[PDB]
Amino acid sequence: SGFRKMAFPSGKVEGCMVQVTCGTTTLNGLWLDDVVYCPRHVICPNYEDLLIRKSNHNFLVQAGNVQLRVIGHSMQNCVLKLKVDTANPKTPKYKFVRIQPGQTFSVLACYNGSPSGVYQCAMRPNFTIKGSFLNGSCGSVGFNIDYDCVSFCYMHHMELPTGVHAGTDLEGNFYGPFVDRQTAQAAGTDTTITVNVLAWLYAAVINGDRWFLNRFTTTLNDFNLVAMKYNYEPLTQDHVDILGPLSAQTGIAVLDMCASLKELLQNGMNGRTILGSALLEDEFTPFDVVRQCS
Amino acid sequence: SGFRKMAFPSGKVEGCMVQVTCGTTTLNGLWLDDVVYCPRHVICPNYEDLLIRKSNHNFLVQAGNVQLRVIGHSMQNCVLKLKVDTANPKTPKYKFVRIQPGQTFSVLACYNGSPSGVYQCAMRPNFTIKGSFLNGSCGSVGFNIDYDCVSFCYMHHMELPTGVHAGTDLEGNFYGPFVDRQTAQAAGTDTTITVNVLAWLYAAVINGDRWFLNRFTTTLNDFNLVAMKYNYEPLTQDHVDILGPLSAQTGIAVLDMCASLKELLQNGMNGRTILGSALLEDEFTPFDVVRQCS
Numbered sequence A, B: 001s002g003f004r005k006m007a008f009p010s011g012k013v014e015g016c017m018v019q020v021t022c023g024t025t026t027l028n029g030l031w032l033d034d035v036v037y038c039p040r041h042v043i044c045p046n047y048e049d050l051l052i053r054k055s056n057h058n059f060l061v062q063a064g065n066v067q068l069r070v071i072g073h074s075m076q077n078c079v080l081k082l083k084v085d086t087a088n089p090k091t092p093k094y095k096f097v098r099i100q101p102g103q104t105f106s107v108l109a110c111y112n113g114s115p116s117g118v119y120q121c122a123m124r125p126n127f128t129i130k131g132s133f134l135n136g137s138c139g140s141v142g143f144n145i146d147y148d149c150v151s152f153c154y155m156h157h158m159e160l161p162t163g164v165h166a167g168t169d170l171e172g173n174f175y176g177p178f179v180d181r182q183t184a185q186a187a188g189t190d191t192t193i194t195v196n197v198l199a200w201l202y203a204a205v206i207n208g209d210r211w212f213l214n215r216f217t218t219t220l221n222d223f224n225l226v227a228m229k230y231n232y233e234p235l236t237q238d239h240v241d242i243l244g245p246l247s248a249q250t251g252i253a254v255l256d257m258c259a260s261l262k263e264l265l266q267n268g269m270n271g272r273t274i275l276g277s278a279l280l281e282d283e284f285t286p287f288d289v290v291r292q293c294s
Ligand SMILES: O=c1c(O)c(-c2cc(O)c(O)c(O)c2)oc2cc(O)cc(O)c12
Pocket: A025, A026, A027, A028, A039, A041, A042, A135, A136, A137, A138, A139, A156, A157, A158, A179, A180, A181, A182
């Protein structure tokens, strides 16, 4: 029993973190096979100009107590690729995967190439994440693990004025309309991930929280009319199919659960809690629930 | 910026998890040097009798794809110690430390010797933890990491009727008045960890949440009179010294912050949130705050 924000074990990613120093800038890098990936901001603006003025000996790469020799450098969008002469012997099976808003992943916060903490995050609908990063965390990566394969999905770059964070996939393509330089850019308006809230309500039922249930049901369209008023994402039919397995385990139809959520939005919780929370949590996917509530 | 429930990177602990099978029972074990630690329940009651009827070949220990040969067995309180012929080459620097109620630690949830997730926990004042464990998680360990040294503080054993969890330290001594057999035992009444709530309020101020602050101050004794009414632990003078460093960074006296907490307890939050939470969080220690809000 129990339900907690659970991150993937980080061992496979810890063995890939390195320190990249160029000039007076030091950040974190990701060492896979004979390539080190890090934010191109380390060379700091026309980055093509700045990179052409660099040489291999300008990049100091340290894997713990062993310095790696850079034999090549290249840029892929906002990510720098430093070729080294040594393939990382701890390289796990991995993939570069771009995730969707509403999906979750684990973050290994790192400083000077040294992991310090691990936690779960969701990609918000506005393509920011509500992370925990201090100065020197650039290059920390987000990831999921499927069996033995690490799917890298995020590299951290910057903090926005509202305190949320922005980054790229491992191909260097930013999530959202953000750029790796100082502008007036700010996060857009955010919405609540409706499908995740419903999954979380199912997790609550699996764990014995039932006070919010009711005998009512609603139509898909009548729920979305109420969800738009409370800044919730519209629920699609495809979201109902994904919530199908959770509906069968609990014997509660999705549209049955939607009626409870509509009641929770219109009335609040009245001093009660759900899974130890006094608000509606939207950072657990249906997969996260099944993984932890199976 | 940002504040999240952050666990320690689990790599150093993942390399110690093994699978222990005796009879038809299979659970998780902890392999350090040439010793495997696991709950004595694996031999299942007079455990001294059950253990005397066992032999080394009765214990199947598997470290991934390599079976470990048991050359000795011994019991230490509720923990079994299986001596193997191979010292774990991934053994980190480690210590066995018993923690105090109110302290936090990271849990590496494991199934069949394979890590599946990592999350933060606090030892509740009633010596239970609000974990996330499914069937087959016995032997999962809780730990802190200081620099390079892993302080193991918890081994999971059982779930109580209320859904909370109970276990021992790595010497096999239970936290709380619980025993490793089926009785009518239940968790006692719990209290809120007052010093941790105050630390969390400091983290909120460091992260820009200030709406709950006020110009009032209170005495230590007048705060405890209000804390006893809301099932909060009494605040001691020693708790004020520990909150000292957080008070200096924010320029807010501890007893100044106590007046805000008293107001929050008497009035609630009135629809507002603190660090993304609608209730008062008590599972962040002062050390956890300084570590993440430095
Ligand atoms: O991508 C960026 C980045 O990596 C860093 C950064 C700089 C350092 O000196 C570090 O030590 C560090 O960890 C990160 O700053 C930035 C500042 C911006 O305004 C915009 C950015 O895009 C980055």
